[PDB]
Structures are given as C-alpha cells and as structure tokens.
C-alpha cells in the first residue's frame, strides 16, 4: 500500500525549534513533489510549504516563511520540516501530503490524494500538570423535570489528553465528556457530565474515574448531592 | 493570496436528500479545483481534483462541477457516512501558493429540541484554591444555535467565560454545551447572585437558572 507517515511533533516552548520528519513508502518518492498542511484546534487546514521532486524549489505561506524550512532526502525517502521561533499561533496538527507526479521531469498534479496520519506540535510555556478534580454537585439548581444533573470539573492540566469514566464504565448512558478547552494559563480544562433520575441522587453513589497518563494522575471523585 | 470562500458553514441534512456545497474564488482559478473530506481525528481525504475529476476510489455519488470562480460539490444521495466537513483548496498559478477554504460542515437534520439548563455552584474544594467556577449545562438540544449570558449580580458578564459544545449525539443528534464562568476568589466572594441566561429557537422565553453564593 501507498503510505505516508510523520513523527517529531511534540511540546516546544515560545521561541524554539522543532523538526519534522515525513517518511514514505510503497511508491516512487524522489518523482513527486511535497507538501506540510497544518490544522490549528478548531480551525481548518492551511498549506504551510512545497518542495519540488528535486529539491530546486521550495516555497511557503507568508505566515511561515522566514521561520521554517522544508527539505528532502530521496535516499532516506524522507521529507523534512526545520519549525523555528515557535509561537501559540504554531500549535496544530501537522501533515505531510503529496503532490505532483513528475515521472522524467514532466509533472501532473492529480490532487493531494496521499496523506499521512500527521503530528501534533504543541506551542506553550507550560509543564506536565495533572489535573485538579472538582465535583458538579446535582441540586435542585441542577434538578428540573425527573432528571438531576451531575459532573465532574477536571481544571488546570497539561498536556492533553484525560480520560473520564463514570463508576468504573457501569455508568454511560447519558454521559457527555466535553472537548478541552485552552485557558489563558495554557493549561487544558474540561467538564464531564450525566443525568440520572433526580430520585436517584440518595441512594446511587456517583463517582467519576480521571485518568492523565502523561503526568501520573489516577482519580476516583464521588459526586455527592448539595 | 487566493481567498476560498465557502458559504454557508453548515449545513443540516437527512441522508437520501441531494446536497450541494459551495466554492468561491477571489480570482480566477480555471478548473484548478480540489474537494476534500475530512472527518474529526482524521486526515483529510481527496474526493475531487481538476474541479470534477473523481479521486481513486472515490463513490459515484460524489460529483464536482463549475469553473474559474465558482465551483459545486453535489453528493446526489447523501449517505450517513457522509457527514463529515468539506474543503475546496486552489492550486492555479506556478509559484504555488495553495490556498483552503474554510469548510462545510454537514450535521444531521432532526426536530427542535429544547436545551435542559442546569448550574453548578463552584465546590468548596475547588473555593479553598482560590478560584472559582461556575459551570452553565444546556443538554440535549437541536439545533446548534444557542447563547448563554453570565450575570454576575444583575450585570452582564464579558470576556470571563469559555464554552465547549459536544458533536451530534449518537443516538439522538443533539448537543449539548458547557458554559464555564471563571473568577478569582476575591471577585467571587464579592457578588452574591449568578445567573446563566439561555435563549434558543425550541424555547418561548429565556431560561435563567440561578444562585446566591452560599446557598
């Protein structure tokens, strides 16, 4: 099968230098020219560089030149990505793509039909955080009909990502786990939420289970009634 | 640069029914015109390139057309594999400058749903810290549009709150949202009514849901 695969992509703080690497496999790489795409959280694809076949041409978003610098080793199979004076802005998904076929030099687009899997590249200050677990009480200001709602405030970690559970998976009908959004402290907070039954908030333990494999952070929170 | 303009951003469809996705160019772009689809957590994938060439593999349902400034995407017969957001991306002059547009999203038709408001008052865990949230919960509606408006007693609250929305329900096709206002201790002892006031289409007037700090 045809295939592209990126790595390197990691945590950088403001101001450094990251470098990409793309490799291929099962066709003939040294004929086609080569893209990086990358995509902010939230927001959509933006071409970032091209390199020809033959290294002679290589061009980039005005966003990104000056600071980055694309390459290519046709032995190796490989596609490069040098990221310099790293900003927020920078944090994103990264992919490599492929681009025209140039068999004896004559090239033919075809469109960017090949793509790899990509690599994140995130920009901040911050330092692996695990996160502080806090309880969404159910009250009657989060009692309406026959239906209590209940949470879990998982605040103030990095980097991404968490997993919830509610007691221990027994528990997943109604059940909405939140994207994480950025704060301004650069640290990622979520929320996890459930409704259950209102009449069952005095009898029904709720407990949410946080798990933050990158820092070392098991928790089990119990969801009490206010 | 190029600008690709792709209006509208949403869509709501129901699978069978023919939908038809939008290109504009700032400039002339001849048929150097390509459709991608993408789907969350995954790369993009190449559905047309040449403005109406089918990629390898690509179902029969997916057609491109159009030239110069204006281009369509049509699928004939949506299926519900196809809910996904779709890219139109230039390629025209030499020097390459590959511009994308913005996206269409295609979500899932279904009847209005009212949001469930609920709110969460912040724990005493969390007060000993020296921050304070409160959590807005709007569950279950349909469809996307809603606003949540934060008082802070009685007086409009800006730039203190962050919000995150759920994709469609699995089952039911409704959102649910979370509104997140965030406060310093001092500030949050210093108040003592907090609001959330939701408005959406599946509700006849706005739905505040309240507290006074310290039950």
């Known amino acids: 099968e045809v295939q592209l695969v990126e790595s390197g992509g990691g945590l950088v703080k403001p101001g450094g230098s990251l470098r990409l690497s793309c490799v291929a496999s099962?066709?003939?790489?040294?004929?086609?020219?080569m893209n990086w795409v990358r995509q902010a959280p939230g927001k959509g694809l933006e071409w970032v560089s091209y390199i020809s076949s033959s290294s002679s041409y290589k061009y980039y978003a005005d966003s990104v030149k000056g600071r980055f610098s694309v390459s290519r080793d046709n032995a190796k199979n490989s596609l490069y990505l040098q990221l310099n004076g790293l900003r927020a802005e920078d944090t994103a998904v990264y992919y490599c793509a492929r681009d025209g076929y140039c068999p004896k030099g004559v090239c033919t687009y075809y469109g960017m039909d090949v793509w790899g899997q990509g690599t994140t590249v995130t920009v901040s200050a911050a330092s692996t955080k695990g996160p502080s677990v806090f309880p969404l009480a159910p009250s009657s200001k989060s009692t309406s009909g026959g239906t209590a709602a209940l949470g879990c405030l998982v605040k103030d970690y990095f980097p991404e990502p968490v997993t919830v559970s509610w007691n221990s998976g027994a528990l997943t009908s109604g059940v909405h786990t939140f994207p994480a959004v950025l704060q301004s402290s650069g640290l990622y907070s979520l929320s996890s939420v459930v409704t259950v039954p209102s009449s069952s908030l005095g009898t029904q333990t709720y407990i949410c289970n946080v798990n933050h494999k990158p820092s070392n952070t098991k928790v089990d929170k119990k969801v009490e009634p206010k | 640069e190029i600008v690709m303009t792709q209006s509208p951003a949403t869509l709501s469809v129901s699978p069978g029914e023919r939908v038809t996705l939008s290109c504009r160019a700032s400039?002339?772009?001849?048929?150097?015109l390509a459709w991608f689809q993408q789907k969350p957590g995954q790369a993009p994938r190449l559905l047309i390139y040449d403005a109406s060439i089918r990629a390898t593999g690509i179902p029969a349902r997916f057609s491109g057309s159009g030239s110069g400034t204006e281009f369509t995407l049509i699928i004939s017969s949506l299926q519900s594999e196809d809910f996904a957001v779709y890219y139109c991306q230039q390629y025209d002059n030499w020097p390459p400058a590959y511009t994308f547009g913005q996206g269409t999203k295609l979500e899932i038709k279904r009847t209005v749903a009212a949001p469930s408001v609920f709110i969460f008052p912040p724990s005493d865990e969390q007060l000993k810290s020296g921050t304070a949230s409160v959590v807005c919960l709007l569950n279950n509606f349909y469809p996307r549009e809603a606003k949540v408006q934060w008082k802070v007693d009685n007086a409009l609250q800006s730039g203190n709150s962050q919000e995150s929305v759920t994709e469609q329900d699995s089952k039911d096709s409704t959102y649910s949202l979370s509104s997140t206002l965030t406060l310093s201790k001092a500030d949050y002892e210093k108040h003592k009514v907090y609001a959330c006031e939701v408005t959406h289409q599946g509700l006849s007037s706005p739905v505040t849901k309240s507290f006074n700090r310290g039950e």
């Open positions: 099962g066709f003939s790489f040294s004929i086609y020219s």
């Open positions: 400039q002339s772009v001849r048929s150097r």
